[PDB]
Design a protein around this motif. Structure first.
Motif, PDB file in Angstrom:
ATOM      1  N   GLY A 157      44.483  47.560  30.678  1.00 12.58           N
ATOM      2  CA  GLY A 157      43.311  47.871  31.510  1.00 12.58           C
ATOM      3  C   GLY A 157      42.766  46.655  32.246  1.00 12.58           C
ATOM      4  N   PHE A 158      43.417  45.498  32.174  1.00  9.10           N
ATOM      5  CA  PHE A 158      42.876  44.326  32.829  1.00  9.10           C
ATOM      6  C   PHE A 158      42.653  44.577  34.326  1.00  9.10           C
ATOM      7  CE2 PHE A 158      43.051  39.796  34.297  1.00  9.10           C
ATOM      8  CZ  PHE A 158      41.995  39.330  33.486  1.00  9.10           C
ATOM      9  N   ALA A 159      43.578  45.259  34.982  1.00 11.96           N
ATOM     10  CA  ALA A 159      43.480  45.473  36.449  1.00 11.96           C
ATOM     11  C   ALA A 159      42.245  46.291  36.799  1.00 11.96           C
ATOM     12  CB  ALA A 159      44.730  46.196  36.993  1.00 11.96           C
ATOM     13  N   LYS A 160      41.793  47.156  35.855  1.00  9.98           N
ATOM     14  CA  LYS A 160      40.635  47.979  36.123  1.00  9.98           C
ATOM     15  C   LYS A 160      39.359  47.063  36.390  1.00  9.98           C
ATOM     16  CE  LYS A 160      40.470  51.978  34.052  1.00  9.98           C
ATOM     17  NZ  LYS A 160      40.273  52.917  32.904  1.00  9.98           N
ATOM     18  N   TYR A 161      39.282  45.992  35.589  1.00 12.90           N
ATOM     19  CA  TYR A 161      38.145  45.081  35.768  1.00 12.90           C
ATOM     20  C   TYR A 161      38.257  44.432  37.141  1.00 12.90           C
ATOM     21  CZ  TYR A 161      36.430  45.263  31.005  1.00 12.90           C
ATOM     22  OH  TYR A 161      35.874  45.688  29.849  1.00 12.90           O
ATOM     23  N   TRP A 162      39.465  43.911  37.548  1.00 12.17           N
ATOM     24  CA  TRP A 162      39.540  43.216  38.798  1.00 12.17           C
ATOM     25  C   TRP A 162      39.269  44.086  40.018  1.00 12.17           C
ATOM     26  CZ3 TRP A 162      38.755  38.291  39.686  1.00 12.17           C
ATOM     27  CH2 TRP A 162      38.438  37.594  38.500  1.00 12.17           C
ATOM     28  N   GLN A 163      39.655  45.370  39.935  1.00 14.73           N
ATOM     29  CA  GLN A 163      39.417  46.250  41.093  1.00 14.73           C
ATOM     30  C   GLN A 163      37.880  46.393  41.224  1.00 14.73           C
ATOM     31  OE1 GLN A 163      37.852  49.307  41.063  1.00 14.73           O
ATOM     32  NE2 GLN A 163      38.038  49.570  43.280  1.00 14.73           N
ATOM     33  N   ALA A 164      37.206  46.504  40.060  1.00 10.05           N
ATOM     34  CA  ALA A 164      35.780  46.641  40.161  1.00 10.05           C
ATOM     35  C   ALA A 164      35.074  45.356  40.685  1.00 10.05           C
ATOM     36  CB  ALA A 164      35.274  47.072  38.776  1.00 10.05           C
ATOM     37  N   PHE A 165      35.515  44.229  40.119  1.00  9.14           N
ATOM     38  CA  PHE A 165      34.909  43.011  40.559  1.00  9.14           C
ATOM     39  C   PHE A 165      35.032  42.878  42.099  1.00  9.14           C
ATOM     40  CE2 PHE A 165      34.503  42.116  36.244  1.00  9.14           C
ATOM     41  CZ  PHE A 165      35.475  41.355  35.573  1.00  9.14           C
TER      42      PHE A 165
END
Ligand code: MG
Ligand code: MG
Ligand code: NA
Ligand code: NA
Ligand code: NA
Ligand code: NA
Lengths: 409, 204
Positions: free
Chosen positions: A343-351
């Motif tokens: 789920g790491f990519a989920k944080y970056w898309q939000a940031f």
């Protein structure tokens, strides 16, 4: 336990520089700055004394000021006869950032007016402004995007002893892997760390050595005025030691110690003595009156976790709660224990999508495994309980993006 | 309750609303609605009209209302849904998670719009979930977001009832007609039918 950092002997003259603080303030487009250096002395105060502060860019002296001691009147009893503030104008300064760590050298000379140098102290200076405005944390007027990691000081053979090679190895790998920021989880670091972050360019969250996680409730000591003195020293002494490093951009009041009135008192102390950096603190629900930044640990991107008292809202939802306006930067997220980072990519898309979501610090850099040797004398990675220690928390000490010897996971 | 002011076809959209010579005509459409309907408890919010861009006349009328009737918020979507002429962020067709960054008047994801730097107002879509034909796909996504975000306070679906008109064939049998079926041209064909119900009130 032990004498785990350097031991040194320092000779100072009887009449000496006892403290100095460097500040850099800018005009609206950062094309002009004023370097202000407050210098304090101890010893023999006489009118022949002077302080010269000179600023260098490589071998070129960009600015210089000299003045006798005696600061401005501050109250009905006068001013500090033992201090002086030098103000140097600097045109078109080269600015410091983690992207381009431009540094100047400030040399602080204590001397007689007729020319005798008594002693000199000095520091690297990075011209940068850190400010939160309209809900955004800005560095030199632009909104940062924190690609951070929490980093404990850990070596599998030497324990908590840090060495230059290891620190450099860590900074190279961090930068090589697109990190630009590090949180000193959860205490001030060995002094060379700051020099290295100033020079290689990493944004730093400097954190007081205060963690009382095992108390019940977690703020039992932090809300108790009897513990204000011991806590105050952990915050004030850190600020006094590390306030001139440009890499330090945010001060933190410690970790997992709930929210107590002593945090509010200390938040205010730092905001009074050092207005140049925001102060953050996660305890007590990550958005208390003791933090300028909403700085949760392990809040998920979309999923709320409404625990009583200290809920961990979805980070996108947290920013818009009624009346909230602060920026949100997770002090810890993406717990990299074992086969993790799902789920790491989920944080970056939000940031990237939400301006006020300005990143976070992964937990954490390096597994805290220790080396043990088997019967045949071959090394092997040990974790909690492997030394007869009990109670223990087994493999919870290994949460790193890299193994203890720095091989990547 | 919404004033009868819509200048969608002008280029740019606020050509008349930013012109002081049109202030008088606009002012009457707002003031006389308030004079007529201000005692009705069902009216909870006044609206300055629709799709007329954002012009200085809107600002002037927004303040008129606030001064004569403090009891009801004033909203207006023109000019980007979050102008100085609205107490509520009230976009039309902003999506739940997907941004649509059009120049000048972007339609941000509603979750993100709430938290843009400095923003603090509630968000209620003046129109959403365009129910034209076989539509309402993704309707649940809006409701899950409204229930999760306190400041996302709902919206008004577009729209209630299809604007079809009855025509009769050779045998005298009625059929539902849309744009162009009366010789009208130019026309926008079936775009007049966007309702949750058919014109005769049978549900879709
Ligand atoms: Mg155990
Ligand atoms: Mg047509
Ligand atoms: Na962001
Ligand atoms: Na751990
Ligand atoms: Na809501
Ligand atoms: Na239509």
């Amino acid at each position: 336990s032990g004498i785990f950092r350097d031991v040194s002997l320092l000779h100072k003259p009887t009449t000496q520089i006892s403290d100095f603080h460097v500040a850099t303030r800018f005009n609206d487009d950062f094309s002009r700055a004023v370097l202000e250096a407050e210098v304090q002395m101890c010893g023999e105060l006489r009118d022949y004394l002077r302080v010269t502060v000179s600023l260098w860019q490589g071998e070129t002296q960009v600015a210089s000021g000299t003045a006798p001691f005696g600061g401005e009147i501050i109250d009905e009893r006068g001013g500090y006869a033992d201090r002086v503030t030098l103000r140097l104008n600097v045109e078109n300064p080269k600015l410091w950032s983690a992207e381009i760590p431009n540094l100047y050298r400030a040399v602080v000379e204590l001397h007689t007016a007729d020319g005798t140098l008594i002693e000199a102290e000095a520091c690297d200076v990075g011209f940068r402004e850190v400010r939160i405005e309209n809900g955004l944390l800005l560095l030199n007027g632009k909104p940062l995007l924190i690609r951070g990691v929490n980093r404990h000081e850990h070596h599998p053979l030497h324990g908590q002893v840090m060495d230059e090679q290891t620190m450099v190895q860590d900074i190279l790998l961090m930068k090589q892997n697109n990190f630009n920021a590090v949180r000193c989880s959860h205490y001030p670091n060995h002094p060379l760390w700051y020099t290295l972050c100033d020079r290689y360019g990493l944004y730093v969250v400097d954190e007081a050595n205060i963690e009382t996680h095992g108390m019940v409730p977690m703020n039992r000591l932090t809300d108790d005025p009897r513990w204000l003195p011991a806590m105050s020293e952990r915050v004030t002494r850190m600020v006094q030691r590390d306030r001139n490093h440009p890499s330090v951009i945010i001060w933190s009041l410690g970790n997992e110690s709930g929210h107590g009135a002593n945090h509010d008192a200390l938040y205010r102390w730092i905001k009074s003595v050092d207005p140049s950096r925001p102060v953050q603190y996660e305890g007590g629900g990550a958005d208390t009156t003791a933090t300028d930044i909403i700085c949760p640990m392990y809040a998920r991107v979309d999923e709320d976790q409404p625990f009583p008292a200290v809920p961990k809202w979805s980070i996108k939802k947290w920013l818009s709660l009624p009346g909230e306006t602060r920026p949100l930067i997770l002090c810890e997220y993406a717990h990299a224990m074992g086969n993790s980072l799902g789920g790491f990519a989920k944080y970056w898309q939000a940031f990237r999508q939400y301006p006020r979501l300005q990143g976070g610090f992964v937990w954490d850099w390096v597994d805290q495994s220790l080396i043990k040797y088997d019967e045949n004398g071959n090394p092997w990675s040990a974790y909690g309980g492997d030394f007869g220690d009990t109670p223990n928390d087994r493999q919870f000490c290994m949460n790193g993006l890299v193994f203890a010897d720095r091989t990547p996971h």
